[PDB]
Symmetry: C2
Subunit: 257 residues, 2 copies
């Protein structure tokens, strides 16, 4: 029944905990004397990078501190300067985050043996993806297809990129495909496309932890942050949720019944 | 609630009985000393033209007859040559086959007044549609969007053309769109695409009759042929069937339940 699985990139396939963008947003502000925290930086993590910045700008705690430094509130010009800077820095360090999350590679290998096609969509622009995809392929991961917002009329949560994949992979109907992501938007997109939607937890942008803090966190404590997200997913359309990609072929087996 | 209707062209919105291609397909085979019947000629109607030709040669009855006449099955060269001919003959007559089927325009206008999007897919190439769509517009019919196989990996039965229509009209999921066509390939295209599928009988390729033949036929005989086409559309996936486009609106309402 299931002939293809469509994977997201950041916090699903690579970039454990999806920090690259977080790391950058913090820098552009820190260098302006208005240092923000991972929480509020990740707070928006889900909309256009351009609008993501503007969001931080309108965050009362940040807005005030900005008006303290520059003796004035952010200007549409500032947003545009901070956005240009965001990209330049992101391009620069994107390679350092393009490593396949330790579990994933073997999983992909297993699915390909079952004759199951591998697709993918993303929030990163084609420019960014070129860089991310290149480093990931060297490091062992390369989907059969990839699409970015640039390829379509609009990115997430629209199902456009998902249809493009089905088109190229040659798979139909949409319920013969699974969408796997690490954020609310990933769930929306999956449903809007009429496909089986799943959500990874450990290493997601939602769980926001690094491999380090995960391997060295209080079990009880961690087993709780996992739920604030696993639940968070189902509350957005995830026909299912998995702590790790190691549970993927299992969900497939379930679905196919 | 439905938001868009994707109409096929010939036999559905224009060219009553889809006659434009008919004699060209029979002519190309008749020059080789291999006669075919309209039924055969019409079987693959709706598919991309080159595919339609290849499909004809695939047909046992025809393949055997060709093998017997030439002492070998049809070749890619044969196919490619007949196609080159098919195009020459078709192009010089296409303008004469872009007239809207009688009451279709009232329907369309009614759909628009209800805020419904109008998309379309076809088996004709982009070059062919240039002629057909131009003439159709002058005669008052012009959907919001048009898609030929030249815009996607493949034509019918694949649901690719339907997805582009969805991307353009910005409608999702596919279950919010209805597909209307006059052939078997139109039916398989709707179910494959995951939308509500409908087949129109009077004027359809499948009915293969002209307006004269339909208004001057033994009523009893007529209702009987309608039944075969009808049974045929369903047999191939149609969710509902209608005799004319006047019924469409009503089937939409039924579905909205
Ligand atoms: Mg992501
Ligand atoms: Mg037709």
């Amino acid at each position: 029944k299931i002939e293809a699985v469509i994977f997201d990139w950041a916090g699903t396939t690579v970039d454990y905990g999806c920090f690259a963008p977080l790391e950058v947003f913090m820098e552009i502000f820190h260098k302006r004397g208005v240092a923000i925290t991972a929480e509020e930086a990740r707070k928006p993590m889900g909309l256009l990078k351009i609008d993501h910045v503007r969001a931080l700008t309108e965050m009362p705690r940040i807005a005030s501190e900005w008006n303290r430094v520059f003796r004035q509130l952010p200007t549409e010009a500032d947003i545009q300067e901070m956005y240009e800077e965001f990209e330049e820095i992101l391009f620069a360090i994107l390679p350092r985050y393009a490593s396949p999350i330790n579990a994933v590679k073997e999983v992909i290998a297993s699915l390909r043996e079952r004759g199951i096609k591998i697709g993918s969509t993303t929030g990163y622009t084609r420019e960014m993806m070129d860089i991310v995809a290149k480093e990931a392929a060297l490091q062992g991961y390369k989907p059969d297809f990839l699409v970015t917002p640039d390829d379509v009329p609009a990115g997430r949560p629209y199902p456009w990129m998902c249809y493009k994949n089905a088109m190229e992979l040659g798979v139909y109907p949409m319920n013969h495909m699974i969408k796997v992501g690490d954020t609310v938007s990933d769930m929306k997109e999956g449903r809007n496309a009429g496909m089986w939607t799943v959500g990874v937890i450990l290493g997601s942008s939602e769980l926001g932890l690094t491999e380090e803090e995960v391997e060295n966190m209080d079990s009880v404590e961690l087993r709780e942050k996992i739920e604030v997200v696993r639940n968070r997913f189902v509350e957005n359309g995830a026909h299912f949720t998995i702590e790790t990609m190691q549970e993927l072929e299992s969900v497939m087996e379930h679905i196919e019944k």
